[PDB]
Tab-separated table of C-alpha atoms and ligand atoms in Angstrom:
chain	number	residue	atom	x	y	z
L	23	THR	CA	190.308	88.352	128.653
L	24	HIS	CA	188.243	87.179	131.843
L	25	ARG	CA	189.357	84.031	133.815
L	26	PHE	CA	186.432	81.962	132.396
L	27	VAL	CA	187.272	82.629	128.717
L	28	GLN	CA	188.766	79.216	127.998
L	29	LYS	CA	185.744	77.451	129.606
L	30	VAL	CA	183.353	79.681	127.821
L	31	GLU	CA	184.982	79.022	124.343
L	32	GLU	CA	185.150	75.176	125.195
L	33	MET	CA	181.369	75.207	126.011
L	34	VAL	CA	180.476	77.288	122.715
L	35	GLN	CA	182.541	75.010	120.550
L	36	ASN	CA	180.779	71.911	122.139
L	37	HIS	CA	177.500	73.477	121.426
L	38	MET	CA	178.576	74.302	117.982
L	39	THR	CA	179.959	70.803	117.185
L	40	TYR	CA	177.536	68.635	119.004
L	41	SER	CA	174.150	70.531	119.647
L	42	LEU	CA	173.378	71.526	116.032
L	43	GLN	CA	173.235	67.697	114.930
L	44	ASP	CA	169.916	66.728	113.832
L	45	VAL	CA	168.240	64.579	116.465
L	46	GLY	CA	165.080	63.995	114.373
L	47	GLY	CA	166.795	61.061	112.909
L	48	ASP	CA	168.646	60.009	115.989
L	49	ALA	CA	167.023	56.758	117.249
L	50	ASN	CA	168.352	57.446	120.764
L	51	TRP	CA	166.170	60.432	121.165
L	52	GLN	CA	162.398	60.632	121.480
L	53	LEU	CA	160.114	63.540	120.216
L	54	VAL	CA	158.063	64.238	123.213
L	55	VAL	CA	156.163	67.450	122.466
L	56	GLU	CA	155.236	69.101	119.161
L	57	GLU	CA	153.351	72.502	118.648
L	58	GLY	CA	153.371	74.619	115.450
L	59	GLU	CA	156.910	74.894	114.424
L	60	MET	CA	158.357	73.736	117.823
L	61	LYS	CA	159.613	70.149	118.314
L	62	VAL	CA	161.050	69.089	121.745
L	63	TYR	CA	162.974	66.076	122.154
L	64	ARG	CA	164.675	64.224	125.000
L	65	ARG	CA	167.035	61.229	125.748
L	66	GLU	CA	166.294	59.263	128.854
L	67	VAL	CA	169.457	59.278	130.758
L	68	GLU	CA	170.299	58.228	134.387
L	69	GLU	CA	173.822	58.178	136.073
L	70	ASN	CA	174.171	56.794	139.573
L	71	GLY	CA	170.437	56.583	140.154
L	72	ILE	CA	169.763	60.321	139.174
L	73	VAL	CA	167.680	61.632	135.981
L	74	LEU	CA	169.903	63.492	133.701
L	75	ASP	CA	167.808	63.529	130.578
L	76	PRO	CA	169.220	65.699	127.973
L	77	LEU	CA	166.640	67.954	126.306
L	78	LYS	CA	166.809	69.569	122.784
L	79	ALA	CA	164.228	71.746	121.130
L	80	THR	CA	163.946	73.252	117.583
L	81	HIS	CA	161.965	76.005	116.683
L	82	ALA	CA	161.640	78.461	113.608
L	83	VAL	CA	160.267	82.082	114.310
L	84	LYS	CA	159.001	84.389	111.643
L	85	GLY	CA	160.065	88.005	111.571
L	86	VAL	CA	162.883	88.123	114.024
L	87	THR	CA	166.770	87.663	113.959
L	88	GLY	CA	169.213	85.336	115.904
L	89	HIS	CA	170.794	88.542	117.275
L	90	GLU	CA	167.307	89.776	118.687
L	91	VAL	CA	166.399	86.373	120.039
L	92	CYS	CA	169.646	86.051	121.918
L	93	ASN	CA	169.680	89.695	123.177
L	94	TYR	CA	166.213	89.106	124.708
L	95	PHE	CA	167.222	85.815	126.200
L	96	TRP	CA	170.569	87.091	127.637
L	97	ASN	CA	169.277	90.426	129.019
L	98	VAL	CA	168.581	90.273	132.503
L	99	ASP	CA	166.732	93.639	132.255
L	100	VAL	CA	163.963	91.837	130.460
L	101	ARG	CA	163.941	88.259	132.209
L	102	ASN	CA	160.784	89.163	134.384
L	103	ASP	CA	158.434	89.809	131.170
L	104	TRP	CA	158.895	86.401	129.798
L	105	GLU	CA	160.205	83.877	132.427
L	106	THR	CA	157.831	82.221	134.905
L	107	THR	CA	160.018	79.531	136.981
L	108	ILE	CA	162.206	82.179	138.569
L	109	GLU	CA	161.535	83.551	141.966
L	110	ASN	CA	164.595	85.905	142.514
L	111	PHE	CA	168.006	86.459	140.740
L	112	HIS	CA	170.706	88.873	140.672
L	113	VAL	CA	174.177	89.620	138.801
L	114	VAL	CA	176.815	88.309	141.095
L	115	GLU	CA	179.767	89.618	138.856
L	116	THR	CA	180.046	91.149	135.398
L	117	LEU	CA	183.051	89.509	133.671
L	118	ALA	CA	182.703	91.487	130.313
L	119	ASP	CA	180.180	93.322	128.149
L	120	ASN	CA	178.699	89.892	127.151
L	121	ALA	CA	179.546	87.677	130.121
L	122	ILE	CA	177.822	87.741	133.474
L	123	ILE	CA	177.639	85.351	136.476
L	124	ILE	CA	173.936	85.133	137.797
L	125	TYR	CA	172.682	83.639	140.935
L	126	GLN	CA	169.095	82.749	141.100
L	127	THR	CA	166.323	80.869	142.846
L	128	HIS	CA	163.442	78.971	141.192
L	129	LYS	CA	159.889	78.798	142.287
L	130	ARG	CA	158.730	75.225	143.205
L	131	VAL	CA	157.958	73.378	140.074
L	132	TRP	CA	157.356	70.112	141.921
L	133	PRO	CA	156.444	69.875	145.575
L	134	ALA	CA	159.937	70.038	147.112
L	135	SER	CA	162.506	72.480	148.411
L	136	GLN	CA	163.338	75.360	145.979
L	137	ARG	CA	166.287	75.071	143.543
L	138	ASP	CA	169.052	77.586	143.194
L	139	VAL	CA	171.480	78.050	140.389
L	140	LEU	CA	174.816	79.867	139.787
L	141	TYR	CA	175.887	80.049	136.277
L	142	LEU	CA	177.959	82.167	133.842
L	143	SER	CA	175.573	83.413	131.132
L	144	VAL	CA	177.425	84.639	127.951
L	145	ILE	CA	176.088	85.967	124.594
L	146	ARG	CA	178.495	85.597	121.648
L	147	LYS	CA	178.472	86.023	117.876
L	148	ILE	CA	179.946	83.169	115.973
L	149	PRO	CA	181.017	84.358	112.627
L	150	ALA	CA	180.045	82.569	109.536
L	151	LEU	CA	183.076	81.018	107.603
L	152	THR	CA	181.483	82.273	104.521
L	153	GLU	CA	179.013	85.317	103.631
L	154	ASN	CA	176.750	82.417	101.996
L	155	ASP	CA	176.115	80.854	105.531
L	156	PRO	CA	174.220	82.468	108.612
L	157	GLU	CA	176.307	83.791	111.504
L	158	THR	CA	175.283	82.054	114.569
L	159	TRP	CA	174.344	83.852	117.721
L	160	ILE	CA	174.444	81.757	121.120
L	161	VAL	CA	173.633	82.197	124.720
L	162	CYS	CA	175.392	79.669	126.872
L	163	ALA	CA	174.266	79.333	130.540
L	164	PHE	CA	176.425	76.971	132.551
L	165	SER	CA	177.026	76.350	136.258
L	166	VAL	CA	180.076	77.924	137.915
L	167	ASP	CA	181.396	78.307	141.511
L	168	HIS	CA	181.792	81.754	143.142
L	169	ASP	CA	183.023	82.550	146.588
L	170	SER	CA	180.262	85.247	147.074
L	171	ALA	CA	177.518	82.393	146.457
L	172	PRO	CA	178.303	79.274	148.404
L	173	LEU	CA	175.733	76.366	148.813
L	174	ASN	CA	172.967	77.314	151.322
L	175	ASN	CA	170.597	75.198	153.513
L	176	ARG	CA	167.203	76.631	152.116
L	177	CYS	CA	167.831	75.730	148.544
L	178	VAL	CA	168.976	72.605	146.644
L	179	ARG	CA	171.807	73.699	144.107
L	180	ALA	CA	170.932	72.695	140.425
L	181	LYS	CA	173.707	72.301	137.874
L	182	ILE	CA	172.946	73.505	134.403
L	183	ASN	CA	174.205	73.492	131.058
L	184	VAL	CA	172.016	75.313	128.593
L	185	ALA	CA	172.157	77.009	125.192
L	186	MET	CA	170.027	78.862	122.916
L	187	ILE	CA	171.500	78.900	119.339
L	188	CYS	CA	170.088	80.930	116.702
L	189	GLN	CA	170.539	81.540	112.849
L	190	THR	CA	168.699	84.110	110.713
L	191	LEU	CA	167.539	83.075	107.238
L	192	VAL	CA	167.220	86.135	105.063
L	193	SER	CA	165.406	85.951	101.758
L	194	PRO	CA	165.736	89.462	99.954
L	195	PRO	CA	162.750	90.774	98.300
L	196	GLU	CA	161.906	91.691	94.630
L	197	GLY	CA	161.872	95.372	93.683
L	198	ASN	CA	163.269	98.597	95.059
L	199	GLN	CA	161.845	97.666	98.016
L	200	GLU	CA	163.726	97.078	101.532
L	201	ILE	CA	163.765	93.830	103.240
L	202	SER	CA	161.052	93.778	106.077
L	203	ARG	CA	160.424	91.359	109.037
L	204	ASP	CA	158.517	89.248	106.387
L	205	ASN	CA	161.767	88.384	104.587
L	206	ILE	CA	163.401	86.953	107.747
L	207	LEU	CA	163.157	83.640	109.880
L	208	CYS	CA	164.961	82.600	112.900
L	209	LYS	CA	166.100	79.050	113.383
L	210	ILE	CA	166.459	77.937	117.025
L	211	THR	CA	167.939	75.151	118.676
L	212	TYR	CA	167.622	75.097	122.344
L	213	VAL	CA	169.482	72.443	124.570
L	214	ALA	CA	169.217	71.944	128.535
L	215	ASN	CA	171.373	69.524	130.495
L	216	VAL	CA	170.223	69.973	133.933
L	217	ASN	CA	171.147	68.159	137.089
L	218	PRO	CA	168.129	68.924	139.548
L	219	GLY	CA	170.439	68.039	142.473
L	220	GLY	CA	168.981	66.218	145.600
L	221	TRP	CA	166.490	63.475	144.787
L	222	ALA	CA	163.033	63.368	143.163
L	223	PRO	CA	160.753	60.869	141.359
L	224	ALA	CA	161.927	60.032	137.931
L	225	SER	CA	158.127	60.103	136.579
L	226	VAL	CA	157.516	63.776	138.303
L	227	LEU	CA	160.749	65.246	137.012
L	228	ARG	CA	160.032	64.041	133.496
L	229	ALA	CA	156.439	65.234	133.739
L	230	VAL	CA	157.862	68.735	134.894
L	231	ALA	CA	160.492	68.971	132.007
L	232	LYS	CA	157.661	67.943	129.286
L	233	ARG	CA	155.452	70.815	130.937
L	234	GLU	CA	157.904	73.638	131.626
L	235	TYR	CA	160.245	73.656	128.362
L	236	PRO	CA	157.628	74.069	125.660
L	237	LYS	CA	155.719	76.502	127.846
L	238	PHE	CA	158.897	78.452	128.226
L	239	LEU	CA	159.858	78.284	124.267
L	240	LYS	CA	156.311	79.197	123.104
L	241	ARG	CA	156.123	82.125	125.648
L	242	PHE	CA	159.709	83.530	124.974
L	243	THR	CA	159.608	83.264	121.277
L	244	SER	CA	156.145	84.954	121.017
L	245	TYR	CA	157.499	87.589	123.304
L	246	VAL	CA	160.551	88.426	120.939
L	247	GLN	CA	157.968	88.661	118.309
L	248	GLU	CA	155.716	91.132	120.096
L	249	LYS	CA	158.679	93.332	121.164
L	250	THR	CA	160.336	93.379	117.768
L	251	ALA	CA	157.289	94.031	115.835
L	252	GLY	CA	157.243	97.196	113.606
L	253	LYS	CA	161.007	97.873	114.661
L	254	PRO	CA	164.004	98.414	112.458
L	255	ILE	CA	165.691	95.092	112.254
L	256	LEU	CA	168.676	94.392	114.337
L	257	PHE	CA	170.696	91.753	112.395
J	320	LIG	C1	163.217	70.887	135.535
J	320	LIG	C2	162.345	71.845	134.972
J	320	LIG	C3	163.034	72.920	134.188
J	320	LIG	C4	162.466	74.268	133.989
J	320	LIG	C5	162.461	74.750	132.655
J	320	LIG	C6	163.317	75.971	132.590
J	320	LIG	C7	162.660	77.084	131.622
J	320	LIG	C8	163.771	78.428	131.731
J	320	LIG	C9	164.347	78.664	130.393
J	320	LIG	C10	165.832	79.144	130.324
J	320	LIG	O1	166.667	78.299	129.839
J	320	LIG	O2	166.270	80.427	130.976
J	320	LIG	C11	167.408	80.860	130.539
J	320	LIG	C12	168.027	82.014	131.172
J	320	LIG	C13	168.582	83.068	130.345
J	320	LIG	O3	169.970	83.294	130.483
J	320	LIG	O4	168.905	81.299	132.136
J	320	LIG	C14	168.263	80.450	133.039
J	320	LIG	O5	167.323	80.683	133.817
J	320	LIG	C15	168.698	78.971	133.017
J	320	LIG	C16	167.643	78.002	133.602
J	320	LIG	C17	167.994	76.528	133.356
J	320	LIG	C18	166.918	75.722	134.010
J	320	LIG	C19	167.122	75.429	135.386
J	320	LIG	C20	166.274	74.169	135.996
J	320	LIG	C21	166.664	73.753	137.375
J	320	LIG	C22	165.383	74.307	138.292
J	320	LIG	C23	164.798	72.999	138.987
């Protein structure tokens, strides 16, 4: 219904079409961090002197659903509990039940001015085309303009295109005998395409990326595990 619907649907379809391709066999990507079930890749890209390195991570998390993962990732009410790089943020506008515009500032992750970001964050269920395939839950976060948050002089305005894309594998048990969290696994794909704005050394920016993304993914996924443990399953 809202004014960004076409852009949202374009971004979701783009992530659905391009972001789920396996980069493990893609020789243009490099596996830069591995820990447990998590693998983090990047493509070294510069355009007009500036580092744009697309990043993609895959992960598989026992005992949670894509719905829960995406709920926790999207829900502003719980951002503080898991996110570490954010200094301040607020919802600038509510577009829909599932779509919000967020303004936020980031703590310095390299010695420079703080970055701010203004993005639409939407949570979407993508229906399976068949009952044999998992449904996909996706949270897309992408930079937008808003009259109420113009560029300011204290921060550099970063531009983002980020998605977390989740599918739930369920393996029904034997017996009589309900499915438990032991019977479920959430496959995650996380993509971040970020323009840091301004200027910074390629080497520091690449070091920060390699540090901050696996840190976030480990902390966030274990957080969803803790918060859902023992609770009825939200498919
Ligand atoms: C350059 C280093 C990047 C820092 C790593 C960011 C980890 C935050 C994880 C994340 O995606 O948060 C999702 C949250 C939920 O809607 O929305 C966000 O906070 C989007 C964050 C995008 C990263 C901005 C990087 C620019 C700062 C210099």
